[PDB]
């Protein structure tokens, strides 16, 4: 029947839920297209996965994404990692993962952060951060 797979991507506080669906080759996030949604200097790193792999491998697949929480730079990394999971999981489950295996191998040899998340947060000390106050007298 209908073909669709669901994957998510995470950052510090940037959660991006995405459904990768059988389509005809269009990709856009939050409904609005990809053409703009980034700071203008960083938009190349949006193109990372599609550019290295070739657009021909995005022939007939549709994707819709929703992202919220965090900050600007956090969100952009979140959504690109969702792209990788979307394409790899749909192909693995519905076509031969042999192509996936070259895809996955080639994709992570360039950069591993495409499929794995980076865990990093903060912690409450009693000094104003990790540095104490100025000594009253010494």
């Amino acid at each position: 029947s209908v073909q669709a797979v669901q994957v998510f991507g995470k950052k510090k506080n940037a959660t991006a839920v995405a459904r990768c669906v059988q389509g005809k080759g269009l990709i856009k996030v939050n409904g609005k297209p990809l053409k703009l949604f980034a700071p203008e200097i960083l938009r190349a790193k949006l193109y990372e996965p599609i550019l290295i792999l070739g657009t021909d491998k995005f022939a007939d697949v549709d994707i819709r994404i929703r992202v919220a929480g965090g900050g600007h730079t956090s969100q952009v990394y979140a959504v690109r990692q969702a792209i990788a999971k979307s394409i790899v999981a749909y192909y693995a489950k519905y076509v031969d993962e042999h192509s996936k295996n070259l895809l996955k191998q080639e994709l992570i040899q360039f950069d591993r952060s495409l499929l794995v998340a980076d865990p990093r947060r903060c912690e409450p000390k009693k000094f104003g951060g990790r540095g104490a106050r100025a000594r009253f007298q010494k």
């Binding site: 960083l42 790193k45 360039f110 950069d111």
Partner: peptide, 12 residues
């Protein structure tokens, strides 16, 4: 030997 487009990579 392994190039990059933009230096904004959050490496450890």
């Amino acid at each position: 030997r392994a190039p990059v487009y933009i230096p904004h990579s959050a490496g450890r």
